[PDB]
């Protein structure tokens, strides 16, 4: 997400990423471990 984006927003997008992986790819996907808090650019409420 971009600069300022609250955790709650970043969760929506994260719940979407998990949803897509749990439907459109149900056959390949085993599990999604979603981490709303830190990426690799940094830590922060706008990363995941």
């Amino acid at each position: 997400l971009p600069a300022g984006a609250t955790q709650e927003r970043t969760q929506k997008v994260l719940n979407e990423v998990t949803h897509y992986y749990l439907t459109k790819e149900k056959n390949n996907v085993e599990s999604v471990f979603a981490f709303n808090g830190f990426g690799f650019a940094g830590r922060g409420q706008n990363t995941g």
């Binding site: 955790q7 969760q11 994260l14 719940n15 998990t18 949803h19 749990l22 599990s31 999604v32 471990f33 979603a34 981490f35 709303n36 808090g37 830190f38 830590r43 409420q45």
Partner: protein, 48 residues
């Protein structure tokens, strides 16, 4: 215990009534910090 903590005396009023910690705050077990929400298939999780 949260109960012990809430029973912390902060102030005695002029008339003799007590001002307890639970009178100014919400005691509850919780986390060291709330920066990372980690869901597993959209469920709350921990792990190593």
């Amino acid at each position: 215990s949260t109960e012990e903590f809430g029973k912390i005396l902060l102030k005695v009023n002029q008339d003799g009534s007590r001002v307890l910690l639970r009178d100014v705050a919400k005691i509850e077990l919780g986390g060291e910090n709330y920066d990372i929400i980690a869901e597993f298939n959209g469920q709350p999780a921990s792990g190593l």
